[PDB]
A paper describes a structure:
The cricket paralysis virus internal ribosome entry site (CrPV-IRES) is a folded structure in a viral mRNA that allows initiation of translation in the absence of any host initiation factors. By using recent advances in single-particle electron cryomicroscopy, we have solved the structure of CrPV-IRES bound to the ribosome of the yeast Kluyveromyces lactis in both the canonical and rotated states at overall resolutions of 3.7 and 3.8 Å, respectively.
The CrPV-IRES sequence consists of ∼190 nucleotides that fold into three internal pseudoknots (termed PKI, II, and III). The CrPV-IRES spans all three tRNA binding sites of the ribosome. PKI is inserted in the decoding center of the 40S ribosomal A site. It is somewhat tilted toward the P site relative to A site tRNA, thus more closely resembling a tRNA in the A/P hybrid state characteristic of a translocation intermediate. The interaction of PKI in the decoding center of the 40S subunit is very similar to that reported for normal decoding of tRNA in the A site (Ogle et al., 2001) and involves an interaction of the conserved 18S rRNA bases A1756 and A1755 (1493/92 in E. coli numbering) and G577 (530 in E. coli) with the minor groove of the elements that mimic the codon and anticodon in PKI. This shows that PKI mimics a decoding event in the A site. The CrPV-IRES also interacts with the top of the 40S subunit through elements SL-IV and SL-V. These interactions involve a cluster of proteins in the back of the 40S subunit, especially protein uS7, which bridges SL-IV and SL-V and are consistent with previous biochemical data (Jan and Sarnow, 2002; Nishiyama et al., 2007). Because the A site is already occupied by PKI and the first codon of the mRNA is not in the A site but just downstream of it, the ribosome cannot start translation on the first codon by binding a ternary complex of the cognate aminoacyl tRNA and eEF1A in the A site.
Residue numbers in the entry:
A (entry chain BX): 2 to 143
B (entry chain BJ): 2 to 180
C (entry chain BY): 2 to 135
D (entry chain BE): 2 to 261
The structure:
Amino acid sequence: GKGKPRGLNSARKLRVHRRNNRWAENNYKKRLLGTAFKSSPFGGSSHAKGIVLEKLGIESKQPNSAIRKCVRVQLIKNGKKVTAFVPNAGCLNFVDENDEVLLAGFGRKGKAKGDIPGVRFKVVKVSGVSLLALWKEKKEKP
Amino acid sequence: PRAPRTYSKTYSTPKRPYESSRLDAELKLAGEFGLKNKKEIYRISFQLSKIRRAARDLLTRDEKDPKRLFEGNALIRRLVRVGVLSEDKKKLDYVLALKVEDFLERRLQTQVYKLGLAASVHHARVLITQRHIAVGKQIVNIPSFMVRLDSEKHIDFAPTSPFGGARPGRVARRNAARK
Amino acid sequence: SDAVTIRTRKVISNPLLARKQFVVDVLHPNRANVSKDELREKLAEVYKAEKDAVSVFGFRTQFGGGKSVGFGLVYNSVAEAKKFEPTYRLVRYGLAEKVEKASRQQRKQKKNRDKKIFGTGKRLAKKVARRNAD
Amino acid sequence: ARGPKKHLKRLAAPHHWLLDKLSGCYAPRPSAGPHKLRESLPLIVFLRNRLKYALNGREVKAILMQRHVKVDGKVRTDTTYPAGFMDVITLDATNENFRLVYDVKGRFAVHRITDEEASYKLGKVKKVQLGKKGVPYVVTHDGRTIRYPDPNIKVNDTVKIDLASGKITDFIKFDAGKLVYVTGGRNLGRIGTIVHKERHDGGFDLVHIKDSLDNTFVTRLNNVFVIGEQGKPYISLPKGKGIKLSIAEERDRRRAQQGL
RNA sequence: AUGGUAGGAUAGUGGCCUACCAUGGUUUCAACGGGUAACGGGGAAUAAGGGUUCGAUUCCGGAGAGGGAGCCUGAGAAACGGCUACCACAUCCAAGGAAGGCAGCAGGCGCGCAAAUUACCCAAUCCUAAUUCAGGGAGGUAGUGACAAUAAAUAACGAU
RNA sequence: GCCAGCAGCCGCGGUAAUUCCAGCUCCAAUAGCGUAUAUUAAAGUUGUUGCAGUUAAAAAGCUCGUAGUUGAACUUUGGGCCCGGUUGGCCGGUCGGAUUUCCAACGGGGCCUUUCCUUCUGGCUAACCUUGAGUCCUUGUGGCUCUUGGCGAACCAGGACUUUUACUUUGAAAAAAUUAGAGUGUUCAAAGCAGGCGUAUUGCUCGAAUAUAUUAGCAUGGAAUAAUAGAAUAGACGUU
């Protein structure tokens, strides 16, 4: 006689005692307050527009040393101030201050990647022309 | 607005992606049967996986119930017409013991090969894309065709075609216009 | 060519418009499919209506060509066609010259240029010269 | 949305009109019929998507204009005349005479009749009143209005009229053993019995029938239409008598009939 | 707020609004509230099955015309390339007074990561007329264009 | 020479650096590569199909409870005769398909074995319990022309009365463009809705599909599953 009511008329007490439970399970937490719209940068999104400030330097977390390349942004929305991260080379160079940049996630949700600490985004485009190209030289910049 | 026109993909990919398991039985397929891309091994795979349940579905009606027989005897005769399964096997039952590999022989791609009119499997194909082969007096330009058993004997070469008629064929309006 | 041959299909004895309706077919070896003007003659030849009183739209031309199909229409007497005929058609055969209204853009803008004028407004022409010369 | 609708999105047209599904964004519809809308038709269908005698619809204005087709022995040059179960449609060119009446399967059908038989029709009786100056009258699913009629006639039968005239020649009754065409409901498109009404009484009355192959059944009183005594069924009936077949049989007759 | 009964109201129905009346209607099977970087869907990406996200955007609805209201015409508008005001904008001026609404095409400004020629036509496509004939930045078509997508050159054959 | 610098993460660099700067050399995509952002699959790390909860992060302190949710079994089974479909064999019956006997599978309508089919008034009959006559031919339960007593559910159409649900079948009613998909040589393809033959000297034509298109609602055959209802202060048929 495990812990649940079982007979026939035990609809009522079931549609409640899952709907309570669900709570805790983290996911169903995000989706009811859902956080996504109020908290976090993109709100209910995937991508966005921003414009750079400084070119900050963030060393490592440690089993590592690794002085990586990050940029503060200004979005073109809530305004948060965010940092974000660059790929490939130096990549830095090609992000010349107060330029237009196109930001996206980091495929991890929330969370925070690899050897970087409070950091949660990547730089996809600039000006809107790739980075991918303004490192495999299929275009160049204005 | 208008009747929004209706369409299902045929493909159903795999559940695990990579495997030196199943992989090195596609490349034993392609290959041996012509084909091209993996977007063939998986078309079929779907359409067998399609039929397969309409059996499962039945079997679980009783036997004898109207629906079960009708499809079976309508289901079956659809596969007798395409050569797929024999005469002698059709109880129902049994269509289940049909692996990928039976269907492939009844693709025009290869039925040409066997009707040799083709060096290897290849010379079996350009041979289809290039308007060359023909069923009635009618061209077909697509490897995946599926051989309807009672045609088969009517498989050509057409009037149009260069290998049975209307003219020599381009490269010949050249060896006769430089001596 | 090795000759056309016009084997025809679905003959209906339309009685409401003198017509005579059917679905045309065509075995052509080396033609590269087949010209209308020419085609009619082929039906008229047989069906006794001197071309003109005839139709034959949406040939379409098997996939190699080889074979064609459409649509069969024999009028009785050209008189009746002149009536139940869709003009767009006779301009295929040169039986009706072609009206050379404007583009539509004008034909619309020209409803919204006499709708404001209550009448002719031919007392706006002499309300011209009681507004100029004063 | 405010007054009543004047269009008809094609899809929304009834699925036995059988209408294509493509090309014509819109089907029709019928205006203010003597018929019911759904279990009816227009000539703009019956004269291209069924018979052929049109190609376009412009073409179907042009056959009508010409006053060259009479419904119930009367012209109409509506374009969407709301015709129905029981009708006459006479072809003036052509003595060519169609009684509307369903397939067996499910349909409408294309049934020819006997230039003689266009003659009359099978008036349903839908109500009965001493009405106006103190005069009795029956008002006929045909949505048509019939006066000085006998009192033997009661609530739920037909009555042969004469098209030329709105007379009321012969009437039939509703009794445990008469033939029945089923108008609407899975069984539209079938005959033919009244085994046993099953009274009740808000409302819902129910009926039992059988047929020529002994199959049987139970549908609504509403959807019943007497035609004669077992035999003489006051018509004609289209093929397959109107019969129903466990597709186990149908498939056969198209296999019997393989001939080309 | 929820119904009764009657009238006014409308093109009508109805607490639509008012006369008097009754105390009702919704609510853990999520109401009312707060959020939405929400116009809805058809559908788009993804594609084994079951799925997860995005659909401001080529068709179907609705909503605005810088905010707000009110109404003249007409069947047909709460119209914004129609008018009165009001307020938030901003133009002419002899300072008396006038006149004004690109989120139609264009174009410039501003904003910003972020997106193009003050170009040629009614010839097609279709609509407006009183009407075959005007007129139609609806439409088309050129210009700019790496958004994507299709095809596919940049070397073959000798002889040494 | 732990300084420049690289490195999505593990990490190189503190005097011979397979990582930095650069030469040659090779590898990968290739008129297109990279880069950042968002989303997807990867994600059986949101999970109904498919998770984990002895200690990894998680069984409430334990019990009662109004909702919610589930809920033992039991209410025609069996057998009897029919007659027919259309897969599969055995003849191909023949100038590669038409069908009969031989004959397996398999559905399915009858009807009967104590057998509701809401059921009355006609018209309706559609079928044979009929049989007024009989016989083409294998020395006959192999083959269907005809009116007379008598089949009602093959059905019209008025009524009296016909528990109700979910579930399932079909079928309709359903906008194209999209998606799948038949045709079809835009030179190929992406496309497109076109084309094909002649006497290309004056006329013939094939088409321009199907299918998906679910969630609500209708009409419909199912009657297993799962609910529910009739009659225990007495009802049910009724010839009186």
